[PDB]
């Protein structure tokens, strides 16, 4: 009667409710006592018992005592004459020079150690282990790479390394300290008005601290102008220290002059310094204190004790240092031969063929197939395919895309560049190993997918013959493309009158600027393309139209493409925000991307770079070759500035697991680590810390599952106290922010959370001199299971919406906490102290849960006139978080993913799928302000719909939403650049199209405003 008695026979009673191998092959963490086969020079195998944690000095010394009890001891030298060696898990044979290292940290395969006399006697040069540890793959694995492009990248890219090292020691020690400790500084020295008003007539109280014995410290409260520089602030604090009943006025002036330049300003509690003449306000720390109603606490640090701290980078140069295409008078043809390794079931599948096409992002000719020959087993075609386009019409960035399909459905895919890194048109036979069908891609062929054969051997290997033409066919030089443009110009001037479908006009002159404004994802029509392409000379008037123009150009007509190359040549530089579109997958031409990197060199500030650095590293995936202008740009900026370098390293080191980029990023990381100076040692200490934490949580998750929290937690604390964990997890820099140092582990504040990912709550001592002034404890979460990079990105997108709103005079407060993905579903999350899930607030207030409990809880923290401003904080944050949330379309918000702070700020966490991923299998509103919230907005009131507080709040929502709608070009493009990462929520442009509807860009701003309210009104049921 429940089930109409329908059985399920299939159902049996006994997914519901990785991994990186550990310290030894096949086991996560070596046993506390292990036996180690020691191969001696004399041929004797002597097995020693060792402690997991024992150093190689400890081991060697003990070995050479035990070696006396064995035969042939007289053959052996002193212990000091030898170094250890063994086969590691990456499968190379490391020579273990640093004998302070311990047995568990060696990444050995099997537990044996061979003894030898050290060869390659320049031992200096075999601290490439350092470089390989940081990168996570050995440098000898690049050495034996056959491909010339790689080897030519490796040697060529040192141009950059050298040039950037030379800027570092241009004013040493000042430039060196400016590299290592660069000034963390806002975009403009111009101030927002809501910030200014918090100044009582352009003035900050500041506190300059000093140390003199060392134990005792001394405040000096200056009240100075916000726009004054650090050198001024430093003088003022010296005046105050040294004024006395024994120094005349003039005596003081002569005491400041000797003193004024022996000091610099440090932030109390972290390694930030004020080394550059900027307004104090233009440093982020100051501008942070003003907003939070805090008193900047600086420190006078003498420069000799700062340059005493600094190193010497000492960069060493490594050991590793026709026919014009337009002559070829034929149409393109490519021979499909045979796939070898196709996994096809004969029982469902009819027939299989190789679909093909040439591409430029979008298509340049009739995409074809071949005949449905030898389907399923035995699969083999022998056809030249014939493509309607001439060999000279092929543009520099042309690419063959193919796929083996079913009947309609893809099985595999792979893409090749039709020219090589040296412009040579592809001839011969190629063996293309294929990539597998992704999630969101249902379409046949996949041209957004990466160029290159799969390094993975056991995959569909489709081979093919390319056409030969009596020579290496090379793409024409720029001088020759120029001349041909200059001819296409003078030629077209003489063409005669009656002519279809190609001075000016006033009606038209505005309609181009009409097009210029439309977002990337507003598709342009053939008429418009023609219309643009004909006025292309007037289009330089509006350099912002360029993306529309480039997409309008016919890339299959070399006459056009030579003309367009020549416009670009001296096109006027444009804004980074818009130029960034020119590095996404739709603009693959090198002259184009060249022009975009030339905009960044002029315009993009080291500040704005690091904001968009994620997007720029992703956009490397869409370059055709390894050596290209963007790579050299970023490589330079990273070696110019160690804050960028840090995140530049990690964003690469994150993706190294991913075989689409392991080569390219691997090679790039090598260059970085070879040039970045002493930061390589700092990165290796982070890299070593993160590994332990991975191996530790990897055990908690496999085997130690099914043991009470208590049991795991005792096993954790047992592990963390081991000397190697102590070594590895204590004196280092937080990767979320290298400014913050991490000292001793407070293991009693350190625990495993409730979650089934077994995320670690970790807590370090902030070992700064003035820790007290900023925070005595730095705590951050390490999370093994989840994929951080959706969150990482949504967090970024928020940070930018904030900066947009605030630099445009309106103060909604977002709290984009730190999130760093350091690997394949591994990462770090910043802990916001003094914050609780609404659901804790409801549990801890629950009488043996009333809608007021939140509001009650909040009053109970914020009493007096404090309360009034603390509601303003909640009202301001909650508005911003409404609009952002709506615009992005993040996961449904609820009581255990919403968080409020003691001071009354609210913010979201664990955002989940960002562009409305789950729901699309609509225009949802994910932040539904329940009664709980509306009560808090309306200090006492019932009927919260009706108050002014809600009208106020509504106004904040409307002003924010339109503010983002004017910078939507950016938000589209930021997401467009993120297509590179295989985030399922961003597989294709139509995924990004959600952000159009929700921002309502096809409508007019007034309609948009109403749509937002319409959307807000039905979700809430009344008010707007």
């Amino acid at each position: 009667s429940y089930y109409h008695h329908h059985h399920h026979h299939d159902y049996d009673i006994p997914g519901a409710m990785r991994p990186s191998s550990g310290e030894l092959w096949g086991i996560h963490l070596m046993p506390p006592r292990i036996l180690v086969e020691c191969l001696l020079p004399n041929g004797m195998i002597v097995t020693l018992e060792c402690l997991r944690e024992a150093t190689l000095i400890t081991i060697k010394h003990e070995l050479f005592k035990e070696a006396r009890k064995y035969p042939l001891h007289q053959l052996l030298q002193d212990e000091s004459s030898y170094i250890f060696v063994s086969v590691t898990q990456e499968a190379e044979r490391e020579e273990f020079f640093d004998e302070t290292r311990r047995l568990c940290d060696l990444r050995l395969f099997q537990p044996f150690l061979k003894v030898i006399e050290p060869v390659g006697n320049r031992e200096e040069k075999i601290l490439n282990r350092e470089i390989g540890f940081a990168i996570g793959m050995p440098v000898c694995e690049f050495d034996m790479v056959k491909d010339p492009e790689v080897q030519d990248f490796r040697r060529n890219i040192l141009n950059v390394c050298k040039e950037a090292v030379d800027l570092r020691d241009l004013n040493s020690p000042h430039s060196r300290a400016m590299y290592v400790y660069p000034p963390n500084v806002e975009s403009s020295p111009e101030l927002p008005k809501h910030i200014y008003n918090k100044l009582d007539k352009g003035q900050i109280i500041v506190v300059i601290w000093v140390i003199v014995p060392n134990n005792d410290k001394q405040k000096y409260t200056l009240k100075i102008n916000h726009d004054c520089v650090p050198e001024q602030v430093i003088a003022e604090a010296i005046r105050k220290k040294t004024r006395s009943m024994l120094l005349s006025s003039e005596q003081l002036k002569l005491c400041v002059l000797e003193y004024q330049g022996k000091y610099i300003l440090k932030v109390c509690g972290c390694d930030e310094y004020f080394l550059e003449k900027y307004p104090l306000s233009q440093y982020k720390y100051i501008r942070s204190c003003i907003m939070l109603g805090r008193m900047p606490n600086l420190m006078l640090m003498a420069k000799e004790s700062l340059y005493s701290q600094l190193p010497m980078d000492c960069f060493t140069m490594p050991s590793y240092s026709t026919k014009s295409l337009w002559v070829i008078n034929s149409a393109l043809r490519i021979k499909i031969l045979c796939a070898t390794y196709v996994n096809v079931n004969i029982r469902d599948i009819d027939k299989i063929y190789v679909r093909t096409g040439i591409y430029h992002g979008g298509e340049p000719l009739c995409d074809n197939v071949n005949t449905q020959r030898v389907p399923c087993s035995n699969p083999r075609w022998n056809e030249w395919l014939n493509y309607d386009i001439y060999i000279p019409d092929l543009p520099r960035a042309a690419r063959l895309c193919l796929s083996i399909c079913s009947v309609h459905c893809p099985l595999a895919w792979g893409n090749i560049n039709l020219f090589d890194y040296t412009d040579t048109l592809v001839s011969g036979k190629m063996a293309l190993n294929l990539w597998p069908v992704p999630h969101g891609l249902e379409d046949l062929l996949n041209p957004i997918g990466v160029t290159g054969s799969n390094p993975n051997k056991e995959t569909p290997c489709l081979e093919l013959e390319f056409d030969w033409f009596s020579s290496v066919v090379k793409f024409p030089d720029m001088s020759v493309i120029e001349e041909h443009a200059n001819w296409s110009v003078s030629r077209e001037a003489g063409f005669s009158y009656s002519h279809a479908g190609l001075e000016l006009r006033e009606n038209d002159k505005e309609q181009l600027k009409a097009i210029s404004t439309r977002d990337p994802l507003s598709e342009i029509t053939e008429q418009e393309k023609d219309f643009l392409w004909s006025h292309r000379h007037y289009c330089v008037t509006i350099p912002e139209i360029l993306p529309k123009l480039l997409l309008s150009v016919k890339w299959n007509s070399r006459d056009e493409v030579a003309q367009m190359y020549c416009l670009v040549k001296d096109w006027p530089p444009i804004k980074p925000e818009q130029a960034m579109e020119l590095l996404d997958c739709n603009y693959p031409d090198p002259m184009v991307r060249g022009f975009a990197v030339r905009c960044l060199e002029k315009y993009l500030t080291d500040d704005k770079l690091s904001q968009y650095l994620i997007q720029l590293v992703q956009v490397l995936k869409y370059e055709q070759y390894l050596d290209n202008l963007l790579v050299r740009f970023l490589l330079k900026k990273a070696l110019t500035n160690q804050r960028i370098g840090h995140f530049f390293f990690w964003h690469l080191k994150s993706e190294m697991h991913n075989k689409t980029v392991s080569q390219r990023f691997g090679l790039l990381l090598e260059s970085y680590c070879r040039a970045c100076g002493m930061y390589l040692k700092h990165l290796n200490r982070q890299v070593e810390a993160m590994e332990k934490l991975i191996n530790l949580t990897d055990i908690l998750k496999q085997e130690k599952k099914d043991e009470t929290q208590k049991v795991q937690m005792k096993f954790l604390v047992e592990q963390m106290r081991r000397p190697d964990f102590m070594d590895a997890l204590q004196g280092f820099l937080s990767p979320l922010n290298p400014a913050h140092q991490l000292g001793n582990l407070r293991l009693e504040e350190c625990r495993i959370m409730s979650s089934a990912k077994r995320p670690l709550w970790l807590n370090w001592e902030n070992p700064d001199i003035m820790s007290e002034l900023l925070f005595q404890n730095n705590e951050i979460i390490f999370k093994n299971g989840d994929d951080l990079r959706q969150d990482m990105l949504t967090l970024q997108i928020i940070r930018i919406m904030e900066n947009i709103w605030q630099n445009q005079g309106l103060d909604l407060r977002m709290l984009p906490y730190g999130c760093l993905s350091i690997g394949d579903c591994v990462g770090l999350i910043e802990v916001v102290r003094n914050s609780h899930t609404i659901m804790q607030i409801q549990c801890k207030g629950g009488l043996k849960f009333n809608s007021h409990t939140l509001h009650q809880w909040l009053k109970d923290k914020n009493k007096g006139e404090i309360y009034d401003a603390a509601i303003d904080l909640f009202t301001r944050s909650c508005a911003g978080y409404c609009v952002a949330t709506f615009i992005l379309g993040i996961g449904d918000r609820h009581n255990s993913n919403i968080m409020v702070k003691d001071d009354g700020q609210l913010f979201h966490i664990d955002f989940g799928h960002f562009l409305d991923h789950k729901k699309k299998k609509r225009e949802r509103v994910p932040f539904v302000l329940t009664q709980d919230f509306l009560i808090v907005i309306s200090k006492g009131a019932q009927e919260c719909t009706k108050t002014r507080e809600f009208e106020r709040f509504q106004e904040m929502c409307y002003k924010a939403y339109l503010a983002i709608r004017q910078h939507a070009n950016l938000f589209i493009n930021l997401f467009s650049m993120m297509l590179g990462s295989g985030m399922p929520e961003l597989q294709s442009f139509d995924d990004i199209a959600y952000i159009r509807k929700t921002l309502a860009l096809d409508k007019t701003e007034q309609e948009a405003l109403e749509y937002f309210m319409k959307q807000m009104n039905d979700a809430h049921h009344g008010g707007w």
Binding site: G43, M44, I349, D443, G501, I524, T525
Partner: protein, 183 residues
């Protein structure tokens, strides 16, 4: 612009013509209600299949990595063995020099202990090779299940898109005339 791509998506070669969408030969230029249930029935079969497609794509890239792990482990074993092979040769150098250097003073005492070492060393090499050998046959049975993962993805993928397509067409039909959330 948003919907016009999700209906032109997966079809053949402002008029939104699909050759990528060429916006403008142009070289010269009845139950009502019961079809509503079918939506839910197919919208459950489609999302039923999704996870079965998802679970396998993980297992695929697991086994892809699990296999690639196993290969390098062999590359390592082989290198490990080579050092043990080198070592047993390294002992046959200086052991057989020291047999005939004296061969007098504690001949039977010493050569037994030198011979013992050589034996342990060989028997070690014996264990590693069988350790390797065992990995390699486990590698093929992995590469087996691997071949089977793609096979079953490439049976489901056609059925998934057709299921998807009919689900849209039904969903179009209902909107033509005139709730859908629960279905």
């Amino acid at each position: 612009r948003e919907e016009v791509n999700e209906k032109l998506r997966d079809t053949a070669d402002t008029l939104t013509l699909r050759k990528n969408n060429k916006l403008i030969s142009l070289a010269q230029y009845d139950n009502i209600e019961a079809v509503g249930k079918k939506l839910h029935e197919y919208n459950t079969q489609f999302q039923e299949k999704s996870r079965e497609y998802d679970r396998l794509y993980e297992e695929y890239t697991r086994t892809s990595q699990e296999i690639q792990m196993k290969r390098t482990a062999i590359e390592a074993f082989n290198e490990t063995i080579k050092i043990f092979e080198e070592q047993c040769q390294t002992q046959e150098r200086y052991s057989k020099e020291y047999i005939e250097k004296f061969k007098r003073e504690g001949n039977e005492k010493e050569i037994q202990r030198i011979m013992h070492n050589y034996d342990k060393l060989k028997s070690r090499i014996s264990e590693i090779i069988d350790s390797r050998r065992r990995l390699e046959e486990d590698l093929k049975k992995q590469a087996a299940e691997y071949r089977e993962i793609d096979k079953r993805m490439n049976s489901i993928k056609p059925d998934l898109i057709q299921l998807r397509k009919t689900r849209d067409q039904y969903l179009m039909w209902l909107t033509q005339k005139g709730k859908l959330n629960e279905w």
